[PDB]
Swiss-Prot record, chain A:
GO molecular function ontology, one term from the record: structural constituent of ribosome
Organism expressing this protein natively: Escherichia coli (strain K12)
Keyword Oxidoreductase among record annotations: no
Subunit annotation: Part of the 30S ribosomal subunit. Contacts proteins S8 and S17. Interacts with ArfA. May interact with IF1 in the 30S initiation complex.
Name of the protein in its database record: Small ribosomal subunit protein uS12
From Swiss-Prot, chain B:
Name of the gene: rpsD
S4 RNA-binding domain mapped to chain residues: 95-155
Species whose genome carries this gene: Escherichia coli (strain K12)
SUPFAM superfamilies: Alpha-L RNA-binding motif
Protein name: Small ribosomal subunit protein uS4
Function: One of two assembly initiator proteins for the 30S subunit, it binds directly to 16S rRNA where it nucleates assembly of the body of the 30S subunit. With S5 and S12 plays an important role in translational accuracy; many suppressors of streptomycin-dependent mutants of protein S12 are found in this protein, some but not all of which decrease translational accuracy (ram, ribosomal ambiguity mutations).
Pfam families (UniProt xref): Ribosomal_S4, S4
Key word Repressor present: yes
Molecular function terms, GO-annotated: mRNA 5'-UTR binding; mRNA regulatory element binding translation repressor activity; rRNA binding; structural constituent of ribosome
Keywords of the record: Antibiotic resistance, Repressor, Ribonucleoprotein, Ribosomal protein, Ribosome biogenesis, RNA-binding, rRNA-binding, Transcription, Transcription antitermination, Transcription regulation, Transcription termination, Translation regulation
A single GO BP: cytoplasmic translation
InterPro entries named in the record: Ribosomal_uS4 (IPR022801), Ribosomal_uS4_bac-type (IPR005709), Ribosomal_uS4_CS (IPR018079), Ribosomal_uS4_N (IPR001912), S4_RNA-bd (IPR002942), S4_RNA-bd_sf (IPR036986)
HAMAP family noted in UniProt: Ribosomal_uS4_B
Family affiliation: Belongs to the universal ribosomal protein uS4 family.
UniProtKB/Swiss-Prot annotation, chain D:
Organism lineage string: Bacteria, Pseudomonadati, Pseudomonadota, Gammaproteobacteria, Enterobacterales
Molecular function via GO: rRNA binding; structural constituent of ribosome
Subunit (UniProt): Part of the 30S ribosomal subunit. Contacts proteins uS4 and uS8. With proteins uS4 and uS5 encircles the mRNA as it enters the ribosome, which may play a role in mRNA helicase processivity. Can be cross-linked to mRNA. In collided ribosomes contacts ribosome rescue factor SmrB.
Alphabetically ordered keywords of this record: Acetylation, Antibiotic resistance, Ribonucleoprotein, Ribosomal protein, RNA-binding, rRNA-binding
Record-annotated S5 DRBM domain positions: 2-65
Similarity comment text for this entry: Belongs to the universal ribosomal protein uS5 family.
Listed result of changing S13P: In strain: SPCR13 and SPCR15; spectinomycin resistant. Not a ram mutation
Organism from which the protein derives: Escherichia coli (strain K12)
Entry GO terms, CC: cytoplasm; cytosol; cytosolic small ribosomal subunit
Protein name according to UniProt: Small ribosomal subunit protein uS5
Domain-level remarks: The N-terminal domain interacts with the head of the 30S subunit; the C-terminal domain interacts with the body and contacts protein uS4. The interaction surface between uS4 and uS5 is involved in control of translational fidelity.
Signal sequence extent: none
Gene Ontology process terms (BP): cytoplasmic translation; maintenance of translational fidelity; response to antibiotic; ribosomal small subunit assembly; translation
From Swiss-Prot, chain F:
GO biological process: cytoplasmic translation; response to antibiotic; ribosomal small subunit assembly
Extra information: The strain missing both S17 and L29 grows very slowly and has a rather unstable temperature-sensitive phenotype.
Quaternary state and interactors: Part of the 30S ribosomal subunit.
Gene Ontology cellular component annotations, sorted alphabetically: cytoplasm; cytosolic small ribosomal subunit
Protein purpose: One of the primary rRNA binding proteins, it binds specifically to the 5'-end of 16S ribosomal RNA. Also plays a role in translational accuracy; neamine-resistant ribosomes show reduced neamine-induced misreading in vitro.
Homology family: Belongs to the universal ribosomal protein uS17 family.
Annotated protein name in UniProt: Small ribosomal subunit protein uS17
Gene Ontology MF: a single term: rRNA binding
RNA sequence: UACCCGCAGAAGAAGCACCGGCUAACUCCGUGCCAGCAGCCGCGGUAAUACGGAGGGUGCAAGCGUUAAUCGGAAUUACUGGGCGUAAAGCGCACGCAGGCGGUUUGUUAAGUCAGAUGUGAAAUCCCCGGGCUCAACCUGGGAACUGCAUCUGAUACUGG
RNA sequence: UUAGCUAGUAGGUGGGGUAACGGCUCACCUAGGCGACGAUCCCUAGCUGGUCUGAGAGGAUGACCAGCCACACUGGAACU
């Protein structure tokens, strides 16, 4: 409180701790698929959510979501990951970029295609 | 860069005539003017405070044929300028060449006037100006160039114009197809069911 | 201990005023007497006196209007723990000029208004409205 | 000619044997656009009964503020429970730049040009309470002159 | 040595020169000692286009500053204009 | 044109030198409190006439040693 | 090359995200705690405006979304501008060096503080009024600003000696 | 969650030395010099005009333009 006190010990803003450290302030990172599996989510939800463990080009190894309905990914699949947690999946803090590198687009999508790596259908 | 779709939809959504057609017709004989477009047009919007601000800004934009980026820049300039920002916004819009071309009656619509401009049919001070957003100044003389003078669009455009209220700040010679931007319009010259302060509110938050 | 007698002065005023007291009294000092002078001259108190020679007791006659205290706020600005000085072109004004700031200059204690008009800056002793 | 503005509607709930009883609250302000402002707060099982009870309260319980050509005399601070409030007389042309709760109060009041900001809890019922009192305690170049016993230039 | 010359500002295809006194070794658009005129080769010539503080130019020459071929021309041109 | 400093003698031990401390008040850049700051200067005292505690007037001159760029002008007050 | 004239024909030139609340935009069909969505709350077990398709609509537009990143809102490190009985926060208590602060009068000093003058504070940038490219971006004239530093000369109420 | 640091060290004399003042260097002499107003040690980093943000005070930052510095495969050296 005292002026004297601040003069001895200045106000010191807290440094923000990141939510996607594996990215190291990069917009995406590349990595190899270590395990490709499903996992169940947290109260109150229930499903078999597709996730993968991925060793990134910078050594970090993280779990990443594989959004969309259907995917053709396996071990040694080279994928691109981006920031973005999965809320009912604790530990999951990244998303896989559908339709980049070895990851295919979602099949048969018509709405929100660009978020699922899907070309515009000839029509 | 231009809105090219159906036009009366825009009027219908904003709840008013936006003069996007010549005016040869009662607008209610061309569309269901008092009902929004779509399956749920009859539905009433219990409309939020943000909503009324948005729609008012859309209304003005749709009147003048301006997309968001340019219109935002228009707000920025109105703000920077001295005097009331809301009124400055309307001065800037009303000083556009496509607009002035419309007000002198050379085009049936601002869309038509804009085409006149783009297609090198309009001169300012005997000099060809072909960009729609060219800011016109007091004492400027805008004219249909000689070769564009026999276009039947222009004659019809001047006829309709003669049937609209006649703008004070423009002196138009229909014979010569030239006209003079005498002065910037005051606020009082422009329609009173435009709520600029809402647009000003939308862009300050 | 009693390390700021001016805050003490401000406060004795403020509290007796809040307590609808007719007058307040405190150990005197030239600097208090210089401030009391400004208050009176600007009509925030009736009048004042100092009594005694060896242990001078200063007395301020407070002022009331609509069964209200004339002094609405009275606050210490500069203080022993943080001296505040301003230049002529930096002189604060209270309530957009409706109140006053008491300023101490090379030419003695006066209001922000006075010091402003006389091309001076000084230590900002207090605000009063 | 009185101007009235609905600031917030809210659902509260009361618990009994049978379960929860839901009701509504309404917070409003009426003003004369020329220096008079009242706020009201009503409760009712249905929203219309609540928005209506409040106007009724807002019409009486109304106070005067010493405006100055559509703007304030001097900067002012207001406080009530969680809400610290601050207002400034802006130059002409600016209009009212302020939060929703305050804007409604200032608009109906007739304060044409002001800079405002709410600190701490923006709880609408206490924000408006704090603004009204701020404007109300706001004194006038004439009353300070009266107070100080002098009609100098400052009058 | 010290030289009086044109530092080319303006934009692509629209040259605009700032006449400057400087140590000849510094880059053309780099460190200079004093600015002393400008030269618009693209001026409409309806109004101005070439302005030189001839008093300070001469002062610097008097102290041995050299002068560009192009500034030496401007000075003869401006001396002719008035 | 006689630029000068005033300070007091904190050390007089060295042969023909002295350490002088110049103290001043300074507004704190962030928190506004006025803080004491001190500047110690190695100064030349040919003849060693300056005693510790003395108050002395000094001036800036050319380098006299790795750390001396100041010399004594005169003593002001002494032996408090 | 800029720019100007001529020829052909609407001819070669529209996509992206969103529509449960925050937040502008709603319906049907499919699915049925699955498949899936999800910035935050939170959606999904038979009427789902929240999943996926469709029709309709909203917002942007040669871009539109997602991710990354700084500041903002955050008065959420609070100098301006916060707190510590019960919410995070009074050291279990006392003595006390350094340090911070210090009652009242006179004289003195003139470091702090205040005033003025002078020099400096590169240009560009920012801002103001103009000028030039068809407009704008852009380029450019002049100004104002650089809220700072330093020297000298004063003022002496307050702080320091 | 670094409290003590320092023998060319701090100063003096004299010789040498540089374009020039100087422990720059050498001999001799004195025993100093720095440090809680943060020395020493450890981590990080080119500095500025300015840039972005913010009503402001601040916060963050130092591509592009301009000024200063430093470097030229790594460590060292001088010659012209
Ligand atoms: Mg564009
Ligand atoms: Mg809060
Ligand atoms: Mg809605
Ligand atoms: Mg979605
Ligand atoms: Mg269904
Ligand atoms: Mg972000
Ligand atoms: Mg902050
Ligand atoms: Mg708190
Ligand atoms: Mg108790
Ligand atoms: Mg506790
Ligand atoms: Mg205790
Ligand atoms: Mg004297
Ligand atoms: Mg121009
Ligand atoms: Mg310029
Ligand atoms: Mg200039
Ligand atoms: Mg500059
Ligand atoms: Mg004294
Ligand atoms: Mg020697
Ligand atoms: Mg480095
Ligand atoms: Mg380069
Ligand atoms: Mg490059
Ligand atoms: Mg550079
Ligand atoms: Mg080397």
């Amino acid at each position: 409180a005292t002026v004297n006190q601040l003069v001895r010990k200045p106000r010191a803003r807290k440094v923000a701790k990141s939510n996607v450290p594996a990215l190291e302030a990069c917009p995406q990172k590349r990595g190899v698929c270590t395990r490709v599996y499903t996992t169940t989510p947290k109260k109150p939800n229930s499903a078999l959510r597709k996730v993968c463990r991925v060793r990134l080009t910078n050594g970090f190894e993280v779990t990443s979501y594989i959004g969309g309905e259907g995917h053709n990914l396996q071990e040694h699949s080279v994928i691109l990951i981006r920031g973005g947690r999965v809320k009912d999946l604790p530990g999951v803090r990244y998303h896989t970029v559908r339709g980049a590198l070895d990851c295919s687009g979602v099949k048969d999508r018509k709405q929100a295609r660009s978020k699922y790596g899907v070309k515009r259908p000839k029509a | 860069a231009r809105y090219l779709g159906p036009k009366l939809k825009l009027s219908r959504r904003e709840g008013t005539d936006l003069f996007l057609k010549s005016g040869v017709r009662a607008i209610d004989t061309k569309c269901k003017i008092e009902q929004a477009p779509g399956q749920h047009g009859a539905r009433k919007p219990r409309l939020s405070d943000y909503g009324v601000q948005l729609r008012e800004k859309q209304k003005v934009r749709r009147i003048y044929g301006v997309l968001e980026r340019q219109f935002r820049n228009y707000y920025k300039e109105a703000a920077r300028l001295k005097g009331n920002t809301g009124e400055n916004l309307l001065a800037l819009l009303e000083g556009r060449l496509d607009n002035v071309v419309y007000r002198m009656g050379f085009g049936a619509t601002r869309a038509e006037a804009r085409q006149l401009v783009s297609h090198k049919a309009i001169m300012v001070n005997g000099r060809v100006v072909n960009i729609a957003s060219y800011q016109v100044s007091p004492n400027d003389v805008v004219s249909i160039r000689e070769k564009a003078k026999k276009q039947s669009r222009v004659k019809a455009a001047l006829e309709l114009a003669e049937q609209r209220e006649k703008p004070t700040w423009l002196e138009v010679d229909a014979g010569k197809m030239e006209g003079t931007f005498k002065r910037k319009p005051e606020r009082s010259d422009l329609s009173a069911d435009i709520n600029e302060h809402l647009i000003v509110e939308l862009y300050s938050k | 201990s009693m390390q700021d007698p001016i805050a003490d002065m401000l406060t004795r005023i403020r509290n007796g005023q809040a307590a609808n007291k007719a007058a307040v009294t405190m150990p005197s000092s030239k600097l208090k007497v210089a401030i009391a002078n400004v208050l009176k001259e600007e009509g925030f108190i009736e009048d004042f006196k100092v009594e005694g020679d060896t242990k001078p007791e200063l007395e301020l006659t407070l002022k009331y209007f609509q069964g209200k205290a004339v002094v609405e706020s009275i606050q210490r600005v500069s203080r022993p723990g943080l001296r505040i000085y301003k230049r002529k072109d930096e002189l604060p004004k209270v309530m957009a000029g409706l109140g006053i700031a008491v300023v101490s200059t090379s030419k003695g204690v006066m209001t922000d208004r006075a010091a402003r008009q006389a091309g001076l800056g000084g230590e900002i002793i207090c605000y009063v409205a | 000619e009185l101007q009235e503005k609905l600031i917030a509607v809210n659902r509260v709930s009361k618990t009994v044997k049978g379960g929860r009883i839901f009701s509504f609250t309404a917070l409003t302000v009426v003003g004369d656009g020329n220096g008079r402002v009242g706020f009201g707060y009503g409760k009712a099982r249905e929203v219309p009964a609540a928005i209506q009870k409040a106007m009724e309260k807002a019409r009486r319980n109304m106070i005067n503020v010493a405006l100055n050509n559509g703007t304030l005399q001097h900067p002012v601070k207001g406080v009530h429970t969680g809400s610290r409030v601050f207002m400034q007389p802006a130059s002409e042309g600016t209009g009212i730049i302020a939060g929703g709760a305050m804007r409604a109060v200032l608009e109906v009041a007739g304060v044409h040009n002001v800079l405002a900001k709410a600190y701490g809890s923006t709880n609408p019922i206490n924000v408006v309470r704090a603004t009204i009192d701020g404007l109300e305690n706001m004194n006038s170049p004439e009353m300070v002159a009266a107070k100080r016993g002098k009609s100098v230039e400052e009058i | 040595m010290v030289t009086i010359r044109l530092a080319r500002h303006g934009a692509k295809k629209r040259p605009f020169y700032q006449v400057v006194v400087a140590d000849s070794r510094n880059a053309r658009n780099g460190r200079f000692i004093e600015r002393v005129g400008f030269f618009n080769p693209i001026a409409s010539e309806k109004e101005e286009g070439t302005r030189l503080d001839l008093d300070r130019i001469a002062h610097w020459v008097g102290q041995g500053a050299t002068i560009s071929d192009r500034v030496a021309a401007l000075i003869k041109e401006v001396n002719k204009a008035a | 044109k006689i630029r000068t400093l005033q300070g007091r003698v904190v050390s007089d031990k060295m042969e023909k030198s002295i350490v002088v401390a110049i103290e001043r008040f300074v507004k704190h850049p962030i928190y506004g409190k006025f803080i004491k700051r001190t500047t110690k200067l190695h100064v030349h005292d040919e003849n060693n006439e300056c005693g510790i505690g003395d108050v002395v007037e000094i001036r800036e001159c050319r380098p006299l040693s790795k750390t001396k760029s100041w010399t004594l002008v005169r003593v002001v007050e002494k032996a408090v």
